[PDB]
Amino acid sequence: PFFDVQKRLGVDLDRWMTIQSAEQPHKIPSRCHAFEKEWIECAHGIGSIRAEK
């Protein structure tokens, strides 16, 4: 069962390496970077079960 402690208290275990656009230390992008901030913007307040459709 997924407890998600790193939500409650403060630490970051991972959460940074996770997706294709976060930091990239010197601020250098990926190729398809610009489509992430597009696609995450879509499904967030969604509950993901209607996201697919």
């Binding site: 250098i28 990926s30 398809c32």
Partner: protein, 96 residues
């Protein structure tokens, strides 16, 4: 493109009759410790051809255990063939 179908046919290196068998266990354990490089290289491209820039360490962490752990399981293979002198997968004794 094409380099993703090789190496993939390579990662069917599993082939399992030759994963546990036949004897000279060291041949079995071998195709295991080289089951990597099918996991490594394959994941050293997709990370690379697109610039992730971050997961780039992951390839390093795919070895550091793959050597650490697979080097453990070598140890037992001394304990087997210490008491014998031939590995020979054909030792079944504990049965069911």
């Amino acid at each position: 493109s094409m380099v993703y179908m090789n190496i993939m046919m390579a990662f069917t290196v599993s082939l399992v009759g030759l994963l546990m068998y036949r004897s000279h266990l060291m041949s079995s354990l071998l195709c295991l410790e080289g089951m990597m490089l099918s996991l490594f290289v394959m994941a050293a491209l997709t990370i690379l051809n697109s610039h992730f820039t971050l997961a780039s360490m992951m390839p390093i962490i795919l070895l550091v255990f793959a050597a650490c752990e697979a080097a453990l399981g070598l140890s037992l293979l001394v304990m087997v063939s210490n008491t014998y002198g031939t590995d020979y997968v054909q030792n079944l004794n504990l049965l069911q």
